[PDB]
C-alpha cells in the first residue's frame, strides 16, 4: 500500500538525514570532460570516473560565491537532502566532497538533456506527452512532501530526460525540510506562487502551483505568465487571471484552474484529499500510477544517444579553468558538507 511504502520511505530517508554521507571521493579520481550546464555558483560538468570508467555529472560550487550570495544554508540543505532521498524520478547523488575552493556533488549522468531543450525545439508537447511527464512529477512531489520536503524550483531547466525517456529531477538548491510555513523568496520568476511573491509565509502548496505552470508550459509551449522583466511577471501571477490556448482540452483547463488557484484553501494538492485530488482528476484518467512508478509505460520519446559520454543533447558552454586555492576558503561555514 501507499501508506506502508511511505513509512519505509520515511525511515530510509531519516537515517540518511540524521547521518549524512561525507567526503566519499576526491577531485583527482575524475577526468573533467565538458560543461553540461551552468547556474549561480558554478558548473555542472561531464566527468569520467577513472577507476570504474563511469561517466557522471559533477556539480561544482564555488564556496566564496556561495557565501557572498548568502547561500550557505541553501547549499547545506541541497547536499543533506539529495544524499538522503531515493526515488525513481530523482537524480542519484553518488559522491560528494569539498576541497579548499569548491564543493562537489557527483550525480548519475542523465544523458537525454533538459526537458527545456526538447520543449523549445519542438514548440509544445501533446497532452498525452505532457501528462506522462506530469505524472512522474506528481508522484515525486507525493514522495518529497511526505518527507516534509519542499522542492521550490520546478522548471523544464531542472528536469532531465533519461535513456528510457523518463524524468529525472535535478537541482535541490532550494529544497528544504520544513514542517511549518517558510518565507524565503526563491525559485524562478515564471514559476513563483502568488504567496511567495506577496511575502506571505508559504508551504508545500507552492510546489503544486509550480506543477500547474509546468503542465501549462509543456502543453502550450509558453508559460502562463511571461513578460520581459521579472516584476511584470509577478503582477500577472498575482492578478488571478490565466488565458488558455484554444487547443487545451476541457479537462486540462479544469486541472489548471485548480493548480493555478490563488486561494490556498482551494488549490489542488492542498485540500483534505491532498494529492488524490490531482491523481483522481479527469485529465489523469488514462494514467497508470503504479506502471508510471515502475517505469513500465512506454515513453513519448527516447532521446538520441551516440554512445557513452555523448553530450549531443546539451548546449555548448564556455569552458573555464578549474582553480583550487592552496588556502582553505570558508572552512568553518561548510564543515558539515
Amino acid at each position: 500500500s501507499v501508506k506502508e511504502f511511505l513509512a519505509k520511505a520515511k525511515e530510509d530517508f531519516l537515517k540518511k538525514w540524521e547521518t549524512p554521507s561525507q567526503n566519499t571521493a576526491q577531485l583527482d579520481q575524475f577526468d573533467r570532460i565538458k560543461t553540461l550546464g551552468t547556474g549561480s555558483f558554478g558548473r555542472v560538468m561531464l566527468v569520467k570516473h577513472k577507476e570504474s570508467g563511469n561517466h557522471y555529472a559533477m556539480k561544482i560550487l564555488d564556496k566564496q560565491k556561495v557565501v557572498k550570495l548568502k547561500q550557505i544554508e541553501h547549499t547545506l540543505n541541497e547536499k543533506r537532502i539529495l544524499q538522503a532521498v531515493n526515488f525513481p524520478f530523482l537524480v542519484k547523488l553518488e559522491f560528494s566532497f569539498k576541497d579548499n575552493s569548491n564543493l562537489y556533488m557527483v550525480m548519475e549522468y542523465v544523458a537525454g538533456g533538459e526537458m527545456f531543450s526538447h520543449l523549445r525545439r519542438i514548440g509544445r508537447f501533446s497532452e498525452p506527452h505532457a501528462r506522462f511527464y506530469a505524472a512522474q512529477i506528481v508522484l515525486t512531489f507525493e514522495y518529497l512532501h511526505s518527507l516534509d520536503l519542499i522542492y521550490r524550483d520546478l522548471k523544464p531547466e531542472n528536469l532531465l530526460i533519461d535513456q528510457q525517456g523518463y524524468i529525472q529531477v535535478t537541482d535541490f538548491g532550494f529544497a528544504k525540510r520544513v514542517k511549518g510555513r517558510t518565507w524565503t523568496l526563491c525559485g524562478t520568476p515564471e514559476y513563483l506562487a502568488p504567496e511567495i511573491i506577496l511575502s506571505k509565509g508559504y508551504n508545500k502548496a507552492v510546489d503544486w502551483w509550480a506543477l500547474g505552470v509546468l503542465i501549462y508550459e509543456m502543453a502550450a509551449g509558453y508559460p502562463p505568465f511571461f513578460a520581459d522583466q521579472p516584476i511584470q511577471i509577478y503582477e500577472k501571477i498575482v492578478s488571478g487571471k490565466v488565458r488558455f490556448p484554444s487547443h487545451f482540452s476541457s479537462d486540462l483547463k479544469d486541472l489548471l484552474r485548480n493548480l493555478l488557484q490563488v486561494d490556498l484553501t482551494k488549490r489542488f494538492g492542498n485540500l483534505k484529499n491532498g494529492v488524490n485530488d490531482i491523481k483522481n482528476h479527469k485529465w489523469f484518467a488514462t494514467t497508470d500510477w503504479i506502471a508510471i512508478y515502475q517505469r513500465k509505460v512506454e515513453a513519448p520519446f527516447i532521446p538520441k544517444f551516440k554512445g557513452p559520454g555523448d553530450t549531443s543533447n546539451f548546449d555548448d558552454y564556455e569552458e573555464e579553468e578549474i582553480r583550487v586555492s592552496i588556502n582553505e576558503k570558508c572552512g568553518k561555514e561548510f564543515t558539515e558538507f
Binding site: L69, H74, K155, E157, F174, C186, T188, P189, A220, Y222
Partner: peptide, 19 residues
C-alpha cells in the same frame, strides 16, 4: 498570437533561479 509574442520576448532562453 501569444506564441509569437513569447518567441519575440527576452525570456525564451534558460531561466536563472532567483534568491
Amino acid at each position: 498570437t501569444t506564441y509569437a509574442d513569447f518567441i519575440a520576448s527576452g525570456r525564451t532562453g534558460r531561466r536563472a533561479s532567483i534568491h
